[PDB]
Design an enzyme around this catalytic site. Structure first.
Site, short mmCIF file in Angstrom:
data_model
loop_
_atom_site.label_atom_id
_atom_site.label_comp_id
_atom_site.label_asym_id
_atom_site.label_seq_id
_atom_site.Cartn_x
_atom_site.Cartn_y
_atom_site.Cartn_z
N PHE A 78 0.75 -1.15 0.00
CA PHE A 78 0.11 0.13 0.00
C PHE A 78 0.85 1.36 0.07
O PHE A 78 1.67 1.39 0.75
CB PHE A 78 -0.76 0.22 1.36
CG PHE A 78 -2.32 0.11 0.76
CD1 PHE A 78 -3.07 -0.86 0.49
CD2 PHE A 78 -3.02 1.20 1.34
CE1 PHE A 78 -4.42 -0.86 0.03
CE2 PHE A 78 -4.39 1.54 0.81
CZ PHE A 78 -5.20 0.42 0.38
N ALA A 79 0.89 2.08 -1.05
CA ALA A 79 1.71 3.22 -1.15
C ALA A 79 0.73 4.34 -1.33
O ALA A 79 0.45 4.70 -2.45
CB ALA A 79 3.00 3.22 -1.92
N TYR B 198 4.29 8.22 0.55
CA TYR B 198 4.95 6.68 0.53
C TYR B 198 5.09 6.26 -0.77
O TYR B 198 5.90 5.46 -0.60
CB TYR B 198 3.82 5.74 1.41
CG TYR B 198 4.10 6.07 2.79
CD1 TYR B 198 3.21 6.79 3.56
CD2 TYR B 198 5.11 5.46 3.67
CE1 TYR B 198 3.47 6.90 5.13
CE2 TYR B 198 5.34 5.51 4.98
CZ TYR B 198 4.26 6.34 5.80
OH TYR B 198 4.60 6.56 6.96
N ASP C 283 4.99 -3.48 4.44
CA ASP C 283 5.04 -2.29 4.20
C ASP C 283 5.97 -1.83 3.36
O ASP C 283 7.10 -2.30 2.96
CB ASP C 283 5.46 -1.57 5.72
CG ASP C 283 4.36 -1.80 6.79
OD1 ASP C 283 2.96 -1.99 6.37
OD2 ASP C 283 4.59 -1.58 7.81
N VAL C 284 5.69 -0.85 2.70
CA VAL C 284 6.59 -0.27 1.59
C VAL C 284 7.75 0.78 1.84
O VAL C 284 8.70 0.54 1.06
CB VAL C 284 5.62 0.73 0.47
CG1 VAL C 284 5.27 2.25 1.37
CG2 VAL C 284 6.38 0.93 -0.72
N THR D 194 2.85 -5.11 23.68
CA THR D 194 1.91 -4.00 23.46
C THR D 194 0.49 -4.63 22.83
O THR D 194 0.39 -3.86 21.86
CB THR D 194 2.53 -2.81 22.84
OG1 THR D 194 3.17 -3.20 21.65
CG2 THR D 194 3.53 -2.34 23.72
N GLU E 47 -2.63 -4.09 13.56
CA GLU E 47 -1.41 -4.86 14.21
C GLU E 47 -1.98 -5.61 15.48
O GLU E 47 -1.63 -6.80 15.99
CB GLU E 47 -0.12 -4.02 14.51
CG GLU E 47 0.90 -4.99 15.20
CD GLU E 47 2.39 -4.17 15.08
OE1 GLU E 47 3.04 -4.19 14.35
OE2 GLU E 47 2.51 -3.53 16.47
#
Ligand SMILES: [Hg+2]
Ligand SMILES: [Hg+2]
Ligand SMILES: [Hg+2]
Ligand SMILES: [Hg+2]
Length: 265
Positions: free
Chosen positions: A59-60, A64, A131-132, A165, A223
């Site tokens: 996904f950009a 990004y 991730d990009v 977390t 996440e």
């Protein structure tokens, strides 16, 4: 499933552990992928004989898109080299996607946003979602392929679960109590068969809508939901931090023999 051909390689040693410094199999018998645990030649043979196609999705959006060039060029150098690869770039700026030269058997599709999931089922065998704003620095190959896999977050691989977390509020669908949890997986690198990845994303999407309606957002968003999903549906392989590292923030510890995919710069 066709037979492998004759191959000459070192005999595995039953009385000699692969690594004596790390856990290489989960308690549900899923391998944990570290350098030194696999013979890539045997794995390449098994997957090529099945003419495996791997989809790599990114996904950009907005700024990004500037990370696409390095991401794709390094992927060309290190990701599934020798196998069929189909890159899926989801972007709000189709025209800003860089013209990257691809090796044979590799293709790229640009999907504008802001496509039908059934398309994935007919075009690839496995899906890898990352991730990009990253770059490949070393081999990332078929050793990661399996029905469902997650990757150990670089900052928590040595932490006790109470330190993870995870979302800790019971009002959230991503809720995980202090006495539960195997590992803390990264939202930025997961994958598996098309069917399993779609199940995971479908479950996450529905869980996030329930949270929205209840006026709550998980601490680490997607996440957090990924972690709840993988807690309840154990991954069939777990990738070591070699697969997603940040050398600027974490250096290069001895336990990592290779840094394969890292944050930019
Ligand atoms: Hg080994
Ligand atoms: Hg994906
Ligand atoms: Hg989601
Ligand atoms: Hg998810």
């Amino acid at each position: 499933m066709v037979s492998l051909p004759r191959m000459v390689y070192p005999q595995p040693k039953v009385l000699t552990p692969c690594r004596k410094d790390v856990l290489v199999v989960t308690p549900w018998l899923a391998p944990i992928v570290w350098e030194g645990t696999f013979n890539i030649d045997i794995l390449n043979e098994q997957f090529r004989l099945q003419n495996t196609t791997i989809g790599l999705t990114v996904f950009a959006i907005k700024k990004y898109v500037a990370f696409l060039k390095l991401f794709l060029e390094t992927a060309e150098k290190h990701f599934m080299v020798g196998h069929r690869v189909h890159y899926y770039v989801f972007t709000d700026q189709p025209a800003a996607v860089p013209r990257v030269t691809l090796g044979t058997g590799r293709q790229l599709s640009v999907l504008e946003v802001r496509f039908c999931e059934r398309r994935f089922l007919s075009e690839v065998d496995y899906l890898v979602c990352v991730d990009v704003d990253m770059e490949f620095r070393d081999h990332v190959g078929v050793e990661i392929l399996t029905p469902l896999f997650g990757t150990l977050h670089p900052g928590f691989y040595g932490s006790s679960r109470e330190a993870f977390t995870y979302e800790r509020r019971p009002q959230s669908q991503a809720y995980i109590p202090k006495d539960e949890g195997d590992f803390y997986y990264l939202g930025g690198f997961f994958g598996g068969s098309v069917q399993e990845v779609q199940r995971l994303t479908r479950a996450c999407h529905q869980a996030m809508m329930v949270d929205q309606a209840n006026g709550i957002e998980a601490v680490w968003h997607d996440e957090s939901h990924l972690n709840k999903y993988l807690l309840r549906h154990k991954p069939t392989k777990v990738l070591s931090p070699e697969y997603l590292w940040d050398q600027q923030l974490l250096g290069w510890p001895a336990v990592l023999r290779k840094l394969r995919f890292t944050a930019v710069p």
